[PDB]
């Protein structure tokens, strides 16, 4: 189960731009402490890891972590079981895992000065945001409140410390530049499949509208829905009568239509309520967000697409969290991904 | 040359602590935007990757990146050739690579507020520092000035952008907490060998004094010298007669003596001047820093140790930069590391 045979592996940086400080660099002057004088900084580049099996079959898979995460979540589960990287190299696919700009081995754009500031230019905000353990507990639907687990839970209980340690802040890099980095990667790789999660769901949809090399998308619990501009359907507020889900992203119809040309599957785990739940903000958030995605997928299919929503409980898998690919039944989740790829011939040469 | 057979691979988080915001968390209230209210944050944890071969031999190797870097530098060279991770798994060693706290997939401790600040407490400084491309060019001895190469250079020319993109800032996490994370890793792994670089040189020496499981150290161009408390020898200023090298770290003799119990090798590349070089600050810095390390190794040997300085040109390898393990001749550099492991019994069961 753990053995992996690689024809090759490695990593590289791709994407990003440069910004410069004032003046000129003099190599006779003290270089330390570091200065912005005469400086060139590489910013917003992306880290990419790849593992290729011997005799690959089908298209490479690009695994794209959710918000505040890194490629670690595809390497191993919190309790040390194989992640999707190993499972899909074993399934004969070349596997790319990324750390997007602003996360993990991706660039965090900061310089000599207050965080994110290059002289008088604010590349990213000095004030950061970051979820707590408690916020992530309910966001990820481990249970309705911190410390509590749903009855059917597939979370690897006992490995909470490992799990929450993988999470962190993201600087305010523009989503345009994150999309740009992945478009460049997709151009480098050739035809491929994007496998996204949470915050990278909407970003992967955007990449596909800019890159015909994206031949399929599987999105695990995407966080933001996407619609043609001016055609966002009515979406109710949350049960607290005041909150709303993430504002839907709107793109021109010419680009939206490109989503109708490839197979797209959204995958949802368990314990999303069917009815309003005003006592549990993030459970109710997930209810309305999943509803918005169902309308997004319908809009794609009305344009002739091949978009589907897979609720893991309807496939016989109970208790999955927001991270089905690291839950205890991740091998079964993986088999469903393999089924998707096989159905559309994305596992054939 | 690229094929790798892994009995297992994966990654995990280790070390770190928690800090807490004020108040309590209520799951009925809006969780986004994120707040420090009722918040627990995991901070200063470390990311660890491992690859184990079939039939391992000897001790596992822990590769520890230099300042502003990540485990990428052991995975691949900037031009995409195998890094030491692959080479040593092929040599039948289990290979660990880390992203230390504050770098890459390690934690960057920031919250909801100005960078590094949790309410009134500064966990890390809001003002960052970061080398420029120009500063790194001369620090790494690609050449004497930005954009210029030494004639003999082993740098993979043409891949400068890829190379500099791997570098970034580090928040002001205490070195004590970085050392603590690796001590905890070494406790978990058992007997092992540390392979360090630049800024992690002094940190690896400190880990060895706190961890008997460290059975050997190979340090590529360590940046800070270490001496027993009160016994720092005379070290000259730089050729400009104003600048100094990094202040040597001083440790109690009782701990320093532990360095005499294991084999230690410092490895230096090429183009470090023998004579004062006032026109080129970082070339002169390397001259005096290398001299300080020669005194540090001598102090270890006067306590009965086995501490050596390997200048790669004396082994017939010319032109190496500050990253010998990603230079064009990194297979030959690796061979010298395997020679060290074999001589000292570290590649036998």
Kindly report the three-state secondary structure assignment for every residue of A84-133. HHHHHHHCCCCEEEEECCCCCCCCCCCCCEECCEECCEECCCCEECCCCH
Q: A227 in a domain, yes or no?
A: yes
Q: Is A159 on the interface with B (CB under 8 A)?
A: no
The answer to whether the Cβ–Cβ distance between A8 and B2 falls below 8 Å is yes
Q: Is A2 on the interface with B (CB under 8 A)?
A: yes
Chain A, window 194-253: residues with a beta carbon less than 8 angstroms from a chain B beta carbon: 240, 243
Measured distance between the N- and C-terminal CA atoms of chain B, rounded to whole angstroms:
25
Q: 3-class DSSP state for residue B324? A: helix
Q: Which residue of B has its CA nearest to A72?
A: B11
Q: Is B63 on the interface with A (CB under 8 A)?
A: no
Q: 3-class DSSP state for residue B19? A: strand
Q: A1 in a domain, yes or no?
A: no
A244 interaction partners in chain B (CB closer than 8 Å) = none
Q: A319 in a domain, yes or no?
A: yes
Q: Which residue of B has its CA nearest to A81?
A: B10
φ, ψ of residue B205 to 5 degrees: the values are -60, -45
Q: B281 in a domain, yes or no?
A: yes
φ, ψ of residue B74 to 5 degrees: the values are -95, -10
Q: B1 in a domain, yes or no?
A: no
Q: B162 in a domain, yes or no?
A: yes
d(CA A329, CA A81): 11
- Provide the domain limits for residue B185: 6-16+46-113+133-343
Beta pairing class for B117-118 and B121-122: antiparallel
Beta pairing class for A306-311 and B4-14: unpaired
Q: Is A17 on the interface with B (CB under 8 A)?
A: no
Beta pairing class for B263-268 and B249-251: unpaired
The answer to whether the Cβ–Cβ distance between B243 and A281 falls below 8 Å is no
Q: 3-class DSSP state for residue B254? A: helix
Q: Is B120 on the interface with A (CB under 8 A)?
A: no
Q: Which candidate, A297, A259, A218, places its Cα nearest to that of A59?
A: A218
> Total structural domains in chain B?
1
Experimental method: X-ray
Q: A55 in a domain, yes or no?
A: yes
Q: Is B22 on the interface with A (CB under 8 A)?
A: no
Size of interface A-B (CB pairs under 8 A): 265
Q: Is A148 on the interface with B (CB under 8 A)?
A: no
Secondary structure string (H, E, C) spanning B100-161: CCCCCCCCCCCCCEECCEECCEECCCCEECCCCHHHHHHHCCCCCCCCCCCCCCCCCCCCHH
d(CA A288, CA B253): 64
d(CA B170, CA B65): 13
Q: 3-class DSSP state for residue A218? A: strand
Q: B27 in a domain, yes or no?
A: no
Give the CATH number of the domain where residue B267 resides. Answer: 3.40.50.1820
B144 interaction partners in chain A (CB closer than 8 Å) = 27
Q: Is B12 on the interface with A (CB under 8 A)?
A: yes
Determine contact, residues B133/A146, Cβ cutoff 8 Å.
no
For residue A157, the distance in angstroms to the closest alpha carbon of chain B comes to 16
């Amino acid at each position: 189960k753990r053995k992996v045979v690689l024809a090759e592996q490695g990593s590289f940086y791709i994407g990003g731009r440069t910004v410069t400080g004032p003046g000129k660099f003099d190599p006779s002057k003290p270089v330390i402490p570091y200065s912005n004088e005469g400086a060139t900084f590489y910013i917003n580049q992306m880290y990419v890891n790849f593992q290729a099996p011997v005799r690959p079959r089908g298209l490479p898979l690009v695994f794209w972590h959710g918000g505040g995460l890194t490629g670690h979540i595809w390497e191993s589960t919190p309790d040390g079981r194989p992640g999707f990287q190993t499972l899909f190299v074993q399934d004969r696919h070349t596997v790319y895992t990324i750390d997007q700009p602003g996360r993990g081995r991706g660039n965090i754009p900061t310089f000599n000065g207050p965080f994110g500031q290059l002289e008088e230019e604010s590349i990213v905000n000095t004030v950061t945001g970051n979820s707590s353990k408690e916020g992530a507990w309910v966001a990820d639907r481990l249970g309705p409140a911190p410390g509590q687990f749903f009855e059917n839970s597939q979370f690897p209980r006992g490995y909470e410390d490992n799990y929450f340690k993988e999470m962190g802040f993201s600087p305010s890099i523009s989503s345009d530049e994150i999309v740009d980095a992945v478009v460049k990667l997709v151009t480098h790789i050739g035809p491929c499949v994007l496998v996204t999660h949470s915050a990278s769901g909407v970003l992967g949809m955007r990449v596909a509208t800019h890159a015909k090399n994206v031949r399929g998308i599987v999105a695990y619990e995407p966080a933001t829905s996407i619609f043609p501009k001016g055609k966002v359907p009515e979406i109710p507020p949350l049960a607290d009568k005041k909150s709303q889900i993430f504002p839907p992203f709107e793109i021109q119809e010419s680009y939206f239509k490109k989503l109708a040309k490839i197979p797209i599957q959204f995958v949802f785990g368990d314990n999303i309520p069917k009815n309003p739940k005003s006592a549990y903000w993030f459970l109710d958030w997930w209810r309305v967000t999943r509803y918005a995605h169902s309308l997004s997928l319908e809009a794609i299919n009305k344009l002739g697409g091949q978009a589907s929503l897979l609720d893991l409980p309807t496939a016989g898998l109970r208790g999955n969290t927001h991270f089905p690919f690291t839950d205890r039944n991740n091998v079964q989740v993986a088999s469903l991904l393999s089924d998707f790829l096989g159905k559309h011939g994305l596992d054939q040469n």
